[PDB]
């Protein structure tokens, strides 16, 4: 995949990034759990969406999970086409 990404040239001028990521612990108070890999140089090294599909299948199904919840009390006819808002208007209003 790294042979086909958009900015391979500026990434070709990027050297010594692994030792830089090792020395990042003396600059930032936030730790990097993925210090050992660079997505722009190594690529994406794992894929876990089949975990999502099989944990939906492991819990019986979508209908059993929705039976555990207040889905039928919403009056929505079908589950497909139902999106969550992350924050609220009042909650985003009281931000700063």
């Amino acid at each position: 995949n790294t042979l086909f990404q958009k900015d391979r040239s500026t990434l070709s001028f990027d050297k010594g990034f692994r030792a830089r990521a090792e020395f990042k612990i003396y600059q930032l108070m936030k730790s990097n759990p993925f210090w050992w890999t660079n997505p722009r140089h190594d690529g994406k090294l794992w894929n876990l969406n089949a975990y999502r599909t099989d944990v939906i299948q492991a819990l019986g199904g979508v209908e059993t999970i929705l039976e555990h919840t207040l889905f039928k009390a919403t009056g929505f006819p079908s589950w497909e086409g139902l999106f969550w808002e992350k924050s609220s208007g009042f909650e985003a209003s009281m931000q700063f």
Binding site: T2, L3, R8
Partner: peptide, 25 residues
């Protein structure tokens, strides 16, 4: 751009030499 092609090619042998560690020897 010829220069851009050259340095993207330089990325290409950089990735191949990264993949060919020990196999090249």
């Amino acid at each position: 751009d010829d220069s851009e092609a050259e340095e993207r090619a330089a990325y290409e042998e950089a990735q191949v030499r990264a993949a060919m560690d020990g196999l090249r020897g």
